Ligand binder design. Structure first.
Ligand SMILES: CC(=O)N[C@H]1CN2/C(=N/Cc3ccccc3)SC[C@@H]2[C@@H](O)[C@@H]1O
Ligand SMILES: CC(=O)N[C@H]1CN2/C(=N/Cc3ccccc3)SC[C@@H]2[C@@H](O)[C@@H]1O
Ligand SMILES: [Ca+2]
Lengths: 714, 708
């Protein structure tokens, strides 16, 4: 909170110094000009004189800091920083070290005053930064310019450019030079990266269609030469998430070594050469171990090999990094898949960075984070990874999280903390990765509520905590929506902020239902909750409409389940007490589904874009002779298709699929095998009802893997 | 409540019958087919020749109702209706009367049961309905189809088509036939009006550019002939809100009498011929009286003359209607300018219909309402005007308002009543017309506030009344936003519903600030209120951005002033108690204005469209040498111009402009008497500064225009 990342060595005195009114600057002409520019901005409108306070800036060896050469740590990007009443020393082991001394100096400066301090500092991990490596909308040019400035402040020296959906990076145009517009933007990003002491690493992802021939080898080197002409001085080749011949480890190694020997080692000034393997995590690695040992043994040793840990999404352990390092014969260059949300695109991941061993710096060549498509939102994790990677031995997860939020939005830090504390879990996903959320209120929640489902009074304080939490959520939502200090951050999170405010309002009303003294008041709160459920549906259908995980989920771990369970319970109790028939459903769904199949009838419908689907069942479905499922839409729509998967990859001989506009006249629609599932085209036929009946004489055992109606788009 | 409009005569027997499952029908082939259709749609049940209670429907003179013919009122659009255990009688004096008996019958039918009742009914006023006569976006075709159905249900027999901004209604394209698309739509509206027993009156507004020559007379008759070909059988000529020769009353009377003699009396089946005068209200009319006496004397007696009362916007009184009737020599055809909002377009006018004398039915030929451009929202007033015009003697302002709301939105009637109660006043306007709002809570508001300000303890009940109001306002806002029973109503009102919810949230937080508790809690509520002010500002600057009264105002008469005064007061008390410097400003302003001049520095900035201006002062214009007024916009914008006024003819001020507030460019002010002005030719602008660069010391206007 004093300093981020925290220095390796810091000795502070209880004496403070004034940023001097008058200063003699020694070394300004010879020290790293990027560092000298930061110094001059910090000394703006102070007197530069041949007899003021001495400020010494330089790299080790420079006349200006010869005197302190014994104090400068002998580590790449290391520096010595000194403030006393006599003078200030800003001494890099190298040019980047001098820049980093200034990034520390800048944080020490509190309202014209400096602490009396001795700092010897350097990074524990050699390469630290970000891989823009996710699926989805690449970062905007303005977002990237903002990222590079943020990296320089937090001593991250690496930006690996590799957005999966950039067609000049991957499938299908990796062979083509960037068009003039994009090329000019990349040239500007490279110049800005250099000015912030960041290595811009341009990656290529050629594996899905690469031929192991001269034509494609030359086009890959020609593309690298064009990027070099734009100023790029670090390069990567990625072979992740591909199939086919491009997965051949001997050919991958031969290509990387060719690039090394004919390009990387021939230019005077290429820094990093990095490759991402096809087997990039332990789980998806073939047990013969031959893929990874082939790379380890054949790839030139200066070449970096990236690794995501024990699974596609995982935290880095001592055992896990030892496992990879033994096979690739060098320290892994970690690709950490957090806070990347490209497989949970309906969630923001704004929680702290944790889970990575703090003792394994010597076992890694580098550590980069793959972030969200929300660039500013990712700064919380990026700031935290910068801190971890520079000084893992002192890494303080929770304080660093707070420091990041206070850095990103000083004007509304407590509101951003409130929002982030309840927007940190991923929810259930195919990669199995979860994070903690709402941990502080969870105990007051669990027993305000296991009690309610059974027992007694529950406690005036597990009610004031939940009421307080909803009140704080609304304050935070409304202040964040109107915040003008980081407009790009507010644009990213706004849809979630809307949903978060509605969650908090629904909670306040549901608690008013629990407090409910008379029937009339209770019905008013009930009707209000039903309206808030509808509003949350409409935000979910109109916000963040991507093809994969459309819509907006928030406060999913603890708060939404507490509110939904408490509403369903208080409604059950009202129905019992007043012999009423109030609907206890917690998610608004305008369409209806009925079944006499035990394992289907309680599955909720979901709307995703122009799809209306039955939530897939985990359990074996027992489908009796004559039993059926029927969907009723809220209106007649033109139909596109129906897709069904029963887990058989075979024709469905026993089932009759029908559509209707009135649920009186039915038209049979023929299911055809398609891509291992069943599909029936509807050819724009009007549909309001969909019905599937077991017309055989026998019970059928299936899984409800998929049951989806697609209707004509708005 | 049970019937709208309430019938002239009603006897109820506090006995019930089941709607007959099996019934016999007499007069189905003889009666108004529009009436027979309504009946058959109500009769869930099987027609028999031999079993079940008898239903008789017909007009006076039909054999089906001969038995009941002396019970039928001898009035145009009159009817007799009877329900007992033995039979149901639906007997019109004329075909429209039979349709009206069915519109009363439909209202009696409750959960498959009818009351035993005898009704004799007829309208007190001959022509009753709506003039779509406002400035602004004309009603959509779908809105108009909905309107005509509602008019038939409420016994409104007149729809006057005359949207000021329809180019084929007004100048110059009143001369041109409607394009094919619009013609086909108007032909459909006339057919639907006819199916709902509504007279479609097509108006023309030719006066701003009319030549009193053969060419324009013929083009007007050719236009009426084309409308007649689309089915129109009633016509109007409007001469309101024009200047020039078209205001000539002798030429107006000659043209209307020519229309009457050559067209209205030549066709076999024209019904209404109506004119709206240039002098259409008492104040606007010539003190010498010649204009109105010319019309009264010269207009053929069958021609109706419209009147809006004592003012452009006014309620109709016995003295008012006597004053006009004496001059026009016939009963005035009232054009009532409510709930028209075309001069207060930032307000919805959803309150009750009141202020019109209930004893003057014999003094008016007609009564039509001019509504809002929000068609569905206008149905509260339209329903109430239908009730008033049919039976003024029994007109119940508040019960009719509640009945309208429960008819329009039965699924959320209490929520619509909550919204409408607090969205009824117009606010200050050039026409001086106001309405009551929030009258329920006004006493608690006035007490709570009177107390709180001069440090006495407020009643717990009154705090509770205000807390209850804000709570109900949020419930209503959230239920209305999601209501699907009247989607078009919810589209019209949605911007106001958003502003209404923010008002209620702001109220709730301002009351939590009054409850006080501890310093850190107060600061949290304070900061929440400032965010809600900001959100209201953004709705007001981005919704309903029309050229006249942009934005969205709600709960303006009582609730927003209460909340804003309570906020400013609790912040004054907190600042004193903690020597804090919290801002007590109630309107968010994204721009900053810093001045070391006295009577200036505390004047709030205002944003309206692409204008940023200092609020003019009615105080001391005293300005020391070297002093400056400086405005800091929230960003750089292309400058359009600056206008400055001090109120004198006259070289002491330097107007300067900047993107950074360090590098300053001078701008020279041109001069036309009092008006100081300078175009900025799209110059970047973030800071504006006006310094006194004189030896000596020294605000009607200080207005920067930027590009949007
Ligand atoms: C090196 C690396 O991390 N590559 C990828 C891995 N991954 C994903 N891959 C999709 C996948 C689907 C099915 C099975 C395995 C992997 S999703 C998240 C991330 C994605 O951001 C990233 O570029
Ligand atoms: C017959 C009739 O009511 N005509 C008009 C009057 N009026 C308005 N006129 C604007 C005006 C401005 C200045 C001086 C006098 C009148 S605004 C409301 C209404 C407008 O709907 C209506 O068509
Ligand atoms: Ca008849």
């Amino acid at each position: 909170v004093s300093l981020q990342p925290p220095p390796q060595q810091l000795i502070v005195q209880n004496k403070t110094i004034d940023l001097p009114a008058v200063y003699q600057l020694n070394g300004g002409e010879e020290a790293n000009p990027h560092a000298v520019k930061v110094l001059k901005e910090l000394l703006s409108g102070k007197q530069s004189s041949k007899k003021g306070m001495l400020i010494s800036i330089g790299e080790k060896g420079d006349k200006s800091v010869r005197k302190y050469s014994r104090q400068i740590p002998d580590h790449k990007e290391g520096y010595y920083l000194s403030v006393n009443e006599k003078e200030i020393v800003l001494a890099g082991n190298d040019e980047r070290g001098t820049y980093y001394a200034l990034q520390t100096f800048a944080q020490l400066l509190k309202d014209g005053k400096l602490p009396e301090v001795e700092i010897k500092d350097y990074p524990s991990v050699r390469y630290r930064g970000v891989v823009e490596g996710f699926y989805g909308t690449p970062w905007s040019h303005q977002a990237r310019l903002s990222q590079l400035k943020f990296y320089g402040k937090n001593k991250m020296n690496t930006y690996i450019y590799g957005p999966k959906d950039d067609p000049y990076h991957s499938a299908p145009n990796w062979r083509l030079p960037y068009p003039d517009k994009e090329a000019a933007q990349l040239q500007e990003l490279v110049a800005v990266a250099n000015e912030n002491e960041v290595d811009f690493v341009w990656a290529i992802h050629p594996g899905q269609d690469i031929k192991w021939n001269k034509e494609d080898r030359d086009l890959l080197l020609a593309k690298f030469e064009k990027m070099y002409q734009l100023g790029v001085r670090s390069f990567a080749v990625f072979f992740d998430d591909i199939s086919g011949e491009g997965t051949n480890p001997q050919k991958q190694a031969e290509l990387l070594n060719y690039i090394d020997e004919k390009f990387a080692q021939v230019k005077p000034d290429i820094n990093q050469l990095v490759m991402c393997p096809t087997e990039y995590n332990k789980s998806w690695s073939n047990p013969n171990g031959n893929y990874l040992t082939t790379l380890g043994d054949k790839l030139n040793p200066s070449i970096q090999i990236m690794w995501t840990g024990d699974r596609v999404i995982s935290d880095i352990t001592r055992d896990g990094i030892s496992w990879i390092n033994e096979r690739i014969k060098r320290p892994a260059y970690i690709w950490w898949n957090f806070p990347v949300s490209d497989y949970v695109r309906d969630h923001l991941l704004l929680g702290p960075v944790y889970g990575n061993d703090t003792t394994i710096a010597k076992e890694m060549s580098g550590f980069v984070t793959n972030p969200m498509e929300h660039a500013e939102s990712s700064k919380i994790a990026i700031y935290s990874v910068a801190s971890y990677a520079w000084n893992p031995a002192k890494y303080d997860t929770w304080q660093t999280w707070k420091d990041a939020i206070r850095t990103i939005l000083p004007s509304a830090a407590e509101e951003l903390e409130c929002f982030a504390m309840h927007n940190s879990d991923l929810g259930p996903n195919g990669h199995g990765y979860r994070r903690e959320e709402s941990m502080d209120i969870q105990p007051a929640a669990e027993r305000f509520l296991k009690a309610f489902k059974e027992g007694k009074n529950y406690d005036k304080a597990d009610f004031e905590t939940l009421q307080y939490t909803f009140e704080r959520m609304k304050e935070s939502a409304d202040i964040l929506l109107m915040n003008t200090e980081n407009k790009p951050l507010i644009v990213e999170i706004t849809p979630w902020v809307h949903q978060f405010k509605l969650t908090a309002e629904m909670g306040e009303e549901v608690l008013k239902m629990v407090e409910g003294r008379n029937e009339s008041y209770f019905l008013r709160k009930y009707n209000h909750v039903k309206a808030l459920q509808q509003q949350m549906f409409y935000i979910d259908q109109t916000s963040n409409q991507n093809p994969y995980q459309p819509g907006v989920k928030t406060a999913t771990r603890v708060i939404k389940p507490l509110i939904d369970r408490t509403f369903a319970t208080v409604v059950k109790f009202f129905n019992q007490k007043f012999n009423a028939h109030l609907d206890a459903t917690t998610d608004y769904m305008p369409h209806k589904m009925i079944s006499n199949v035990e394992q289907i009838k309680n599955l909720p419908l979901q709307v995703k874009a122009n799809r209306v689907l039955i939530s897939p069942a985990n359990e074996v479905v027992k489908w009796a002779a004559g039993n059926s499922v029927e969907i009723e839409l809220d209106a007649i729509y033109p139909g596109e298709n129906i897709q069904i998967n029963f887990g058989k990859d075979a024709p469905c001989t026993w089932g009759r699929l029908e559509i209707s506009t009135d649920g009186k006249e039915w038209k049979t629609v023929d299911l055809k095998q398609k891509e291992s599932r069943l599909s029936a085209g509807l050819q724009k036929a009007p549909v309001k009802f969909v019905r599937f009946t077991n017309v055989s004489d026998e019970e059928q055992q299936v899984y409800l893997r998929q049951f989806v109606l697609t209707i004509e788009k708005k």
